[PDB]
């Protein structure tokens, strides 16, 4: 622990701190969530998570030299908090958690988008609850309306030549996580077609030239699933 230190973090996070004071608090909490056992994460709990999500909302609502670092450090704290079942369960109990992870998919902050996309991908493949992919898509829809963009555009932007290989891989990994776990053939075919129409068709040609095994693994999953679906439609 200590257990007392968890309560101290909550009190600090609720205190109205900003800028580098906030980042310094977040960095200390990120270490504690990584180094302490799950029991400590449970002591920090739903209330600790809620304090983190309230700040992240505020950071969006007020459009700050430290904003992008504070948003990403919060995402790092969520990455640690969600590295166990209790954390996952507690995040999925929130009303706004998934939406805030989707709003973290900003390709202009690529390492934050990578971290958030990985967390989302892991939710989608969970045995339970089922159909987390649907909740992710609901939140992508809400973000699209709020940002006035097409809903898959952030994922496409992540695949543009110019981005890091790690971001490209995380984008295609989330695409696969949205499609592959779905039981309904016609839904898989639909989503795939929506991505193709937005521009994935052209992008894929560029991705296949990349000599990176992690990319090849995701392209393989994507192409096979596509092939099976079209087979099943005949």
């Amino acid at each position: 622990g200590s257990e007392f230190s968890a309560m101290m973090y909550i009190q600090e996070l609720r205190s109205g701190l900003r800028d580098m004071h906030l980042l310094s608090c977040l960095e200390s909490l990120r270490v504690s969530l990584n180094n302490n056992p799950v029991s400590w994460v449970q002591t920090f709990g739903a209330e600790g998570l809620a304090s983190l999500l309230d700040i992240l909302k505020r950071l969006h609502d007020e459009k700050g030299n430290y904003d992008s670092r504070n948003q990403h450090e919060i995402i790092r704290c969520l990455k640690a908090f969600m590295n166990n079942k209790f954390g996952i369960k507690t995040m999925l109990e929130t009303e706004e958690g998934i939406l805030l992870l989707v709003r973290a998919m900003d390709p202009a902050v690529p390492n934050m988008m990578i971290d958030a996309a990985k967390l989302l991908s892991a939710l989608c493949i969970l045995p339970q609850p089922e159909d987390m992919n649907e909740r992710v898509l609901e939140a992508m829809t809400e973000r699209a309306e709020m940002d006035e963009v097409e809903r898959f555009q952030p994922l496409l932007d992540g695949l543009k030549s110019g981005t890091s290989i790690a971001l490209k891989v995380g984008c295609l990994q989330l695409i696969n996580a949205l499609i592959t776990p779905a039981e309904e053939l016609d839904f898989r075919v639909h989503i795939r077609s929506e991505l193709m129409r937005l521009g994935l068709h052209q992008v894929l040609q560029e991705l296949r030239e990349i000599e990176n095994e992690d990319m090849k693994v995701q392209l393989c999953v994507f192409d096979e699933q596509g092939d099976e679906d079209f087979f099943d439609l005949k």
Binding site: S121, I125, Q173, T180, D214, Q218, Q225, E228
Partner: peptide, 15 residues
């Protein structure tokens, strides 16, 4: 099924 093996490969990639 082939889809379930694929899901397992996605999980292994995330780990």
């Amino acid at each position: 099924t082939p889809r379930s093996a694929r899901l397992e490969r996605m999980a292994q990639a995330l780990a």
